[PDB]
Amino acid sequence: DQGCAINFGKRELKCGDGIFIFRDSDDWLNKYSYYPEDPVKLASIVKASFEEGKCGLNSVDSLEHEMWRSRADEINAIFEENDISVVVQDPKNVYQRGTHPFSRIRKNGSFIIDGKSRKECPFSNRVWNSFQIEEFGRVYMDAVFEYTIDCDGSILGAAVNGKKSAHGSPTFWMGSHEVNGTWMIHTLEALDYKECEWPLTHTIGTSVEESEMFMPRSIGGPVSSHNHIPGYKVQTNGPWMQVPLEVKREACPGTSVIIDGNCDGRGKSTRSTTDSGKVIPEWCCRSCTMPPVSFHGSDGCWYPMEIRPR
Amino acid sequence: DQGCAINFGKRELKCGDGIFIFRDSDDWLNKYSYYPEDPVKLASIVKASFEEGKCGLNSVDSLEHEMWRSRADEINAIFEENEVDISVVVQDPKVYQRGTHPFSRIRKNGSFIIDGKSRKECPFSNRVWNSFQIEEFGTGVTRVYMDAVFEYTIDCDGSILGAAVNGKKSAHGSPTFWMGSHEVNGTWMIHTLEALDYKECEWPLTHTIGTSESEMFMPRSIGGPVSSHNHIPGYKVQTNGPWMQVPLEVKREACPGTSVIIDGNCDGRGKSTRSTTDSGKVIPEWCCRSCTMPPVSFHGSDGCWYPMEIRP
C-alpha cells in the first residue's frame, strides 16, 4: 500500500508503505460489479435450496440486495431454458435475520429474495448469510453451506493510532477518540440495519462487557472499549431500524434537556415530534452528560433511552 | 487525514479520509529531537528522586535513551549553577530492562547513573523506569515532547503506537517494532517481524486487534501484542527465545549451511541455540518435533538463531 497520508493535528506528511483504511468506501455508493459463482452453478444452488423447502432468501446487507436485483434476470433466463422465477422485492433498509444456510447441490413457484413476512413463509424458512467474498476489489462471491452469524471479514477494516480509531465497512463507520483518559464515540454513520455481529478478529481492544457499549452487539457493532459514550448504557430499544443514521452530540431543534434526578428513565426511545408533527420541548433526563445525543434518520430527530419526555 | 494509495503503471489514485499507519516509522531512524518537561523542572525532579533514594534511571526505549544522551549536559549545567553535588552519567545498554519505581514528586559528586550495569551497589530496585508521557508529537518542517508521571505503570505509551486490519491483512506498529500478519487458508499467522530493541513494557490492551497466553509467538512480558494475529502455526510461545539481540528479523527460511527434518523421536522445547558453535563451526544435524516444513530462524547480532522447538 504505497500511499501518502497527511495529518493536521500532529502535522505529519510521512509517506511510504503500510496499511490504509478509507472511509470513501462509504462514498463509492454504486461502483461495484458483483459477479457470483457463475450463471449456472448459482441457478442449480437456488433451485436445490427451493426444492428442499426454503421459500425465499433474506439479504444481509445492501450489497447482497443490489447483486440479486441486478442478476435476477440472468438466472430467470437460465431457468427458462432448462419452473421457478426470482422476484426481488424491496425492504427499505431493514434486513433482518434469517435462520438457514444454503443447501447442498443434489404452478409458478417463487423464490422471493427479501419480502414481507406475509404468513406464507416466515423468517424461519429463509437463507440469510451464505456467501463469502474472495477478492477485495468488481467483487466475486462464493456460496457457503455452513450457517454463520458473524459478518464477512474480507470487506471490514479497523485501525488505531495515537488517540484515534475507526471501525469501518462499506455501510458503517464509527470513529472514536480518547479525551481525558477514556475512549468515546464521536462519529457514527449507518446506511443499513444489519444483524450480523462484528467478528472478534477485527475489533480493537476487546476487553469490555456488553453493558457500557453504545451500539448493541446484535445490531452489528464492535465489541470494544472504543464503542461507548459516557453516561449512556446499551441502546437496546434505540432508533436503529431507520434509513441512513447519524449519531450527533447536540440537542434536537426547538427542545431542551435539564439534568434532574427525579424523572423516570431507561425505557424506549421517543421522537422529538409527536404523531401529529409537533415538538415537545419539555425533556428531562437522569444523570447524563452535559450535551445530549440524538439520531438523525428517516423520520428525523430521535432521542436515546435515557432522555424522556417529562 | 486526507491521504491516498497509488498503483504505479496502473495509474489509479484513491484519495479520501480514514486512518493511515506506515511501516516507515521503522525507516525514519534519526529525525526526532526529544524535548523533556523543561530544562529546569526535570533537574528538580531527578534531584528529589536522588534525595529520596533512587540510584539512577533505566531507559525503556531507544527514544528515551537518545533523549538522555543528548540532554544530560544541560541538566549537568543547571545542577552546577544551582550549587548541588550531583551529576548524571549515561552508559550504553547495547537491551533495556525493568526498574521498580516511578519519578518522585517535587517536595562529593554524587552519581545518578542512567542505564549501567548492576554493579552490586545500585541495583534495579533503586531505579526509575517508566515515568514519561508524550503529549504532543511535534511539528517537524518531528519534536516529541515528554511530560513526567508519578505513578508506576507497566504498559507502554499509546501516543506512538498503532494497529490496523483490513481484508486479510494486519500490522502492529511502533518506531521500534513491526509485526505483520495475514490470513491464509483459515487462521492468521505472522509473516514479518522486525524488532530493534529489547523493551519490557507490555503492549496496551486498547491498541491490540482481536484480544481473544500459550500460543502467542512473541511473549507478553517482552512487549508484544496479545492477539490471535500474534502467532506462527506449529510454534508455541517463545519464552527462552533469542530476543536479547540487536535488530532481529524473523525469517521463514532454512539457516545457511544447515538442514532441518521433522522427527518424532528427538527432544524439544529447550532454549534457543545459535547455528554456529562457540568456535564458529555450524552444526547441521537439526531436528524438530511437530513443526512446519519451512523453518523459522531469527537473524540478529550473531546471525542465525533457532527457536525453542528445534534442537541439535
Residue numbers in the entry:
A (entry chain a): 1 to 82, 85 to 108, 129 to 159, 166 to 338
B (entry chain A): 1 to 94, 96 to 108, 129 to 162, 165 to 235, 238 to 337
Relevant lines from the article:
As the multifunctional protein within the Flaviviridae family, Non-structural protein 1 (NS1) is considered as a promising target against flaviviruses. Moreover, the sNS1 lipoprotein is involved in virion production, immune evasion, and multiple aspects of pathogenesis. The NS1 monomer has 352 amino acids, forms 2 α-helices and 20 β-strands, and contains 12 conserved cysteine residues that form 6 intramolecular disulfide bonds. The NS1 monomer consists of three distinct domains: a β-roll domain (residues 1–29, β1–2), a wing domain (residues 38–151, β4–7 and α1–2), and a β-ladder domain (residues 181–352, β10–20). β3, β8, and β9 are from a ‘‘connector’’ domain (residues 30–37 and 152–180) and connect the wing to the β-roll and β-ladder domains.
The cryoEM structure of the YFV sNS1 tetramer is determined at a global resolution of 3.57 Å and is further improved to 3.31 Å by focusing the refinement on one of the dimers. The local resolution map shows that one of the dimers is blurry with a worse resolution, indicating its flexibility. Then, we performed focused refinement by applying a mask on one of the dimers and improved the resolution to 3.31 Å. The atomic models of the YFV_NS1_tetramer and focused refined dimer were built according to the density map. The chains were named AaBb and Aa for NS1 tetramer and dimer, respectively. Generally, all flavivirus NS1 dimers have a cross shape, formed by the intertwining of Monomer A and a, showing two distinct surfaces. The β-roll domain, the greasy finger (loopβ8–β9), and loopβ5–β6 in the wing periphery region form the ‘inner’ hydrophobic face, while the wing domain and β-ladder form the outer surface. In addition, we also use the Alpha fold to generate the 3D model of the YFV NS1 dimer. The structural comparison showed that the RMSD of the two dimers structures is 0.847 Å, suggesting the modelled dimer structure is very similar to that of the YFV_NS1 dimer.
